[PDB]
Amino acid sequence: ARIAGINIPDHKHAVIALTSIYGVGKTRSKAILAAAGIAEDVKISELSEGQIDTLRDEVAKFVVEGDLRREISMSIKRLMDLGCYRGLRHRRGLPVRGQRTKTNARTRKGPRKPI
Amino acid sequence: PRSLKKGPFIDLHLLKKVEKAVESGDKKPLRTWSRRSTIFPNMIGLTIAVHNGRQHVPVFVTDEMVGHKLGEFAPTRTYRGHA
Amino acid sequence: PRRRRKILPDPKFGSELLAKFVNILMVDGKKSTAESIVYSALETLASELEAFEVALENVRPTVEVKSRRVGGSTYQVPVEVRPVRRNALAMRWIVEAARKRGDKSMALRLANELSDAAENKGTAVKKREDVHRMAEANKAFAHY
Amino acid sequence: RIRIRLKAFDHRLIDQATAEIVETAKRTGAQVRGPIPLPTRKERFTVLISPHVNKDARDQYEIRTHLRLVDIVEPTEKTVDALMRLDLAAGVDVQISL
Amino acid sequence: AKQSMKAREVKRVALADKYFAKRAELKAIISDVNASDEDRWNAVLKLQTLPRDSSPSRQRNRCRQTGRPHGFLRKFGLSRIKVREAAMRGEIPGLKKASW
Amino acid sequence: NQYYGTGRRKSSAARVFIKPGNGKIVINQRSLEQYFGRETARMVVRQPLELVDMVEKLDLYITVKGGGISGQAGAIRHGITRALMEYDESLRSELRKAGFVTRDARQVERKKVGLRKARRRPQFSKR
Amino acid sequence: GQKVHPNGIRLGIVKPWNSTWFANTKEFADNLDSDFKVRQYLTKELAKASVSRIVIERIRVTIHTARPGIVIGKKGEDVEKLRKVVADIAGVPAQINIAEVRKPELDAKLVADSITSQLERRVMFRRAMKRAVQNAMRLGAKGIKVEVSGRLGGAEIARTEWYREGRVPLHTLRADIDYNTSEAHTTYGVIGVKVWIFKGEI
Amino acid sequence: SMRDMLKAGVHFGHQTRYWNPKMKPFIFGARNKVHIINLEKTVPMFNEALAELNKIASRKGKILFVVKDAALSCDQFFVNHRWLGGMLTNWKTVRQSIKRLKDLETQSQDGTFDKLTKKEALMRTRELEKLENSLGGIKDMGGLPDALFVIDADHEHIAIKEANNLGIPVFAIVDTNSDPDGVDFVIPGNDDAIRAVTLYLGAVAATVREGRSQ
Amino acid sequence: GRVDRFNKRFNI
RNA sequence: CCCGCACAAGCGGUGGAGCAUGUGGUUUAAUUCGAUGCAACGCGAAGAACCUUACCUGGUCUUGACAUCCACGGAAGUUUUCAGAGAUGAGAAUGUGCCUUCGGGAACCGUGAGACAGGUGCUGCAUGGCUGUCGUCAGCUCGUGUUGUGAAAUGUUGGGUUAAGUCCCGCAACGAGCGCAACCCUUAUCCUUUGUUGCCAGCGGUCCGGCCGGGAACUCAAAGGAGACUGCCAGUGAUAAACUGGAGGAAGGUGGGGAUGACGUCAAGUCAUCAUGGCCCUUACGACCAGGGCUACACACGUGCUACAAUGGCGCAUACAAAGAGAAGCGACCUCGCGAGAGCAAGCGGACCUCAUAAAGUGCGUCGUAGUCCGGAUUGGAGUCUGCAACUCGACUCCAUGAAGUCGGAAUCGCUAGUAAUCGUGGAUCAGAAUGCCACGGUGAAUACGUUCCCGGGCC
Ligand SMILES: [K+]
Ligand SMILES: [K+]
Ligand SMILES: [K+]
Ligand SMILES: [K+]
Ligand SMILES: [K+]
Ligand SMILES: [K+]
Ligand SMILES: [K+]
Ligand SMILES: [K+]
Ligand SMILES: [K+]
Ligand SMILES: [K+]
Ligand SMILES: [K+]
Ligand SMILES: [K+]
Ligand SMILES: [K+]
Ligand SMILES: [Mg+2]
Ligand SMILES: [Mg+2]
Ligand SMILES: [Mg+2]
Ligand SMILES: [Mg+2]
Ligand SMILES: [Mg+2]
Ligand SMILES: [Mg+2]
Ligand SMILES: [Mg+2]
Ligand SMILES: [Mg+2]
Ligand SMILES: [Mg+2]
Ligand SMILES: [Mg+2]
Ligand SMILES: [Mg+2]
Ligand SMILES: [Mg+2]
Ligand SMILES: [Mg+2]
Ligand SMILES: [Mg+2]
Ligand SMILES: [Mg+2]
Ligand SMILES: [Mg+2]
Ligand SMILES: [Mg+2]
Ligand SMILES: [Mg+2]
Ligand SMILES: [Mg+2]
Ligand SMILES: [Mg+2]
Ligand SMILES: [Mg+2]
Ligand SMILES: [Mg+2]
Ligand SMILES: [Mg+2]
Ligand SMILES: [Mg+2]
Ligand SMILES: [Mg+2]
Ligand SMILES: [Mg+2]
Ligand SMILES: [Mg+2]
Ligand SMILES: [Mg+2]
Ligand SMILES: [Mg+2]
């Protein structure tokens, strides 16, 4: 239930429950479970304290949660500090990957701001 | 990005200009239009004046800039806000 | 139009009425999907075609309103409903009702709506009653 | 066996070119598996017909490439020499394979 | 199109033909898996030094009658406009108005 | 002796060989249940035999190409109908009255310039 | 409305192509460009020879001319000059054949060229048009239409004038409609001439 | 004769309310609100008409009846269905439709209706019958009538107006309800009874034959 | 940092 | 008085969300130019990294990048060095041909000169050509005749009828032309011919695969025919046109779809496809180059895509297409890679080979109504490929991330059947770069009482 400093849900199949961890998607969850030997459809409730400890070991092989959040923060900070084009896009809160800003770009810009 | 098998691109004209700048000393800003050139390790500590379309923007090359294109440090569009 | 179709019956029961019902249930030309829902619903509800008739009888409207503009004023005049349109509206209202329910499968939503329909309970039956309410509130404008 | 593939843009022209080949090849002693009509290619082209804008104003053109196969089974000296003295109508493309 | 623009294409086609084999050689080295890094690196640098107009990707197909750089059809070597003009005069063999 | 019929529907074409037998149906070297999953497709195939009451009195050897499930089922019905009329010419009227003798000539209408599909016009903005 | 090209719509119904060769994609655009250059050369070189039509087969060129004598020349000297130049354009051995146009008053291109010649020599446009119509109907046209458009008589406002006689059933696909165009380059600008000649059905 | 024409019923006119006041000279009286033609005027006037129809016949002049039996029985011409407006004044155009009637009479014999499409061959025959009813009795005329004989001047006012325009002597049976102007030789009588018309038709047919023969 | 990935990823 | 998805009856959308795309605006050195109610706004553009490119900044040229003419030089060419962002300057090595009247001319290169070249500069309100549009709406006219002092009228109106100025009948009109219809293409049935690269009924084999021998039946290919005419029948109608139903028939009343656009209208669109009168620039408004821009972003609008889930998502298994493209191309098999891909390398200028695996579907399992096993935006890291080159500004892959969104206010759009809806597939352009466009099949509805109303139109 407690892996990587988070409560993973007990009622869900293990492959879905592990995707509660920041840094673990569908592919890494399947990989974690294949390594630990746990079947992917088994609920976290069904698993035993020993099996949960083998998941904790397999999750610790990846960078997850706060270790991943600081890695991402630092990667963005680096760009901003460089003052490269991508950095400036991060500073201005605009699309970083060449998207149009004449329209759209609402995910980056947020809600519409009347004149 | 450029496929790793082909190596990092750099304009030959800039490569030779950097090599000559390194061997000579702490020389003047290197004027270039080669925005597409990758920043190599041996450019660290040089000032490259990179063309942005109208001016050569001085870019003091640091270790963090290595692997990036020079054009990344010379914005081409001026924008200060709409109102 | 200014100048005034063949339906193939359902395989399981040989009813053109149930073939029409599948067609009303069907989305995006996915008839096999719709057939499996209806047959699941009828089996659950159940004869299959008797229970469907009972459900239709309690949703079928005999009268409804039609908007009629006369002298620059638009009144809701009562009109009789034709045998075909009675079935058509009943089936449309059952499907609409079933879709709005918050049960699991459409199979279950539909079976419940058809079971409710036979009890004179569901929103399909409510819709018929609302159409009959509207036709009686405008009984004044009947043969205008 | 000599395979002769004829192509043309007109079917009446290709039918006459086949009709000449079968006649001359069969006049001489040759087994001729007669003109097999192979699938016509229809290459289509849509073009805007205005010089400017009016995107929905188009012409649709096609070139139909007609195609015929004639196999000359068990041929002779007189066969191939007769087939080198035909001036088949221009606009018919003859491709002889062996 | 302007006369100069037509002259640029001619110049691009000529240089492309004139350096075609040299470019093919260098690009073979660059992409070859079983070649030295130095050989690949020298080939990368040499390919730059050739005229940019020797690259075939620099060529823009233009209508052979007008020079129009848009609406080209490769079959005919003409723009949509000059195709239609030729088509209707019966100058394009086999080509007629299609309906189906 | 075997009686033949070609059947066609949409882009499907079916070759139907009928002979006296026990009600075996083979479609592309597979049973009717194997070939057609859908019960409507199976119904459509068996409709002409059910009409003329020769469901268990004939063996069908069927090949079918082109189109989809419904196309091919409809092609086969047309082919069975034509094979039945070769088998017995008195059946024409019954099969004709059922609507099985007609070659359903409805085809996909071509896409047209300026339309998204055959008829679907793009959306109009007045203002 | 805009009208379909009368020639184009009748290709392969009652009207032949003017280029009859086969090519695959490799040679098709090259053949079209060489054909264009051959017709361009011959149109200019035989501008005073009443050339109606230049049929190209692959190179074999047939020149339909109302004056076969002026094209051919003395002992076929002039046609031999053309044939050498056509061979140089096409880059293959050339034959030039010469078809006679017996009735140039019934040939749409020659009538159109006749009108535009007169317009460039400042003939009154109505006079040129009306005689073109008269002559065609005299020589047994089932009908003729002539349309002239532009700054007629050097007017500031351009306009289209047309005259028709007989039948010109342009929607009838089996109608033998001979259609062609010409431009008169005047001192006031381009006047366009269109001529339709109906020679009967089938 | 005054006797001949009484049995015929020439003397009976139209009803008195529907009369033309220009026919006041030629009306004797009024029995039962039916104007009675003065036969003392008629027979003198019908004879001077026949004198002239003899003369025009005797100059080999074509007499257009406006009936079929009488015109055919003296080798002259008739229009017995609706007079097409501009039959004489627009003869140049109308004659082109007679040329079309001639052609469909040949295409019967040559067999052309039994050559073309069945349903657009009977169509070409439907013209022949339509053109026959209109243009049949002037098929083999080939010009203008040198004189026009008319039954009812008012009913056939178009024919009479065309004849005046061109300068073609008009002879006509003018009832008590009809206008005499535009008729060179007025013949007062009855145009609406068959034994009166067939009498008039029979008597003009006499002088045509006799004029041409003599 | 960036010099290391450069010298590793690219073979000179 | 009629008609049309015009409304109504329906089904699915748009308007809300994210994203794509065009436009306005704003911004900018430049955000090149054009299209602007319907009939501009995924429009010219069938594809802007460079090129394209028309714009900007800077660097450059001046008879010129592109022609002809003249004189003088000199074969073309090829190879390579230095400087330069490149344009372009300087070189250096080398070649020394062909025509051979043995004269020299001619290629092709320079340099000088000035006739000129050049202009995507302006005017679409000077134009040609081409196009949109009312509208595939049923109209629009003429000759002759007649009527009216005349402008004009009649014909063309009227009674019926038609999808139709369609046809019949009447009629001062009689005829004719351009439109309507038909002729054209395609699709639905059949026949004949041919029978591979396509086909496999029967017949032998068989490795069980049309695989083989064979067969010419059938599918199919594509040439030639046949077929539908209100032809037949009944009733209705003016002894009419036609209408209504029936038979037979694959098809029935124009069978379905396409092409086909009358006289004209909007000084509609396009001088930037091209052409062209006039005007204007000519060491510049022409020409070459590198780099930038056309991709900007408080924002507004249009067109789309993807969603919001359970008629669904995911996993596994497993069916059934059509149409098309391909030689500097399509690229199998095999091997390597989680994958995009890579390596090796057949076959195929194609009914043969390749792209290429249809997807929705069906079966089984799982999720169990949650902002979720819905959604897939955004962003980080790592890659692949094309391409001199993907910083500005490519597509794709992998791992991670996991936004808005709970079916969208007023309003508004499309569609009458193999239609809508939904599902994949292909093509043009194209080195690469589609949610656009053009095309192809699969599955496959609902509804139409009716003509009051809204919109457009026709006749009196
Ligand atoms: K996660
Ligand atoms: K952008
Ligand atoms: K224009
Ligand atoms: K008139
Ligand atoms: K101009
Ligand atoms: K750029
Ligand atoms: K889109
Ligand atoms: K939208
Ligand atoms: K499921
Ligand atoms: K999710
Ligand atoms: K890029
Ligand atoms: K919406
Ligand atoms: K492409
Ligand atoms: Mg992922
Ligand atoms: Mg982009
Ligand atoms: Mg030019
Ligand atoms: Mg390109
Ligand atoms: Mg479709
Ligand atoms: Mg509605
Ligand atoms: Mg929206
Ligand atoms: Mg302009
Ligand atoms: Mg703009
Ligand atoms: Mg569009
Ligand atoms: Mg650019
Ligand atoms: Mg250099
Ligand atoms: Mg100019
Ligand atoms: Mg204009
Ligand atoms: Mg404008
Ligand atoms: Mg009118
Ligand atoms: Mg007409
Ligand atoms: Mg038509
Ligand atoms: Mg019937
Ligand atoms: Mg204007
Ligand atoms: Mg540039
Ligand atoms: Mg743009
Ligand atoms: Mg092919
Ligand atoms: Mg593909
Ligand atoms: Mg998901
Ligand atoms: Mg929900
Ligand atoms: Mg419709
Ligand atoms: Mg799609
Ligand atoms: Mg009308």
Author numbering:
A (entry chain M): 2 to 116
B (entry chain S): 2 to 84
C (entry chain G): 2 to 5, 10 to 51, 57 to 154
D (entry chain J): 5 to 102
E (entry chain N): 2 to 101
F (entry chain I): 4 to 130
G (entry chain C): 2 to 59, 64 to 207
H (entry chain B): 5 to 70, 80 to 227
Task: Quote the original article.
Water molecules are visualized within the antibiotic binding sites that are preordered, become ordered in the presence of the drug and that are physically displaced on drug binding. We observe that many antibiotics displace bound waters on ribosome binding, but also form additional interactions via coordination of preordered waters, as illustrated for tetracyclines, streptomycins, spectinomycin and kasugamycin.
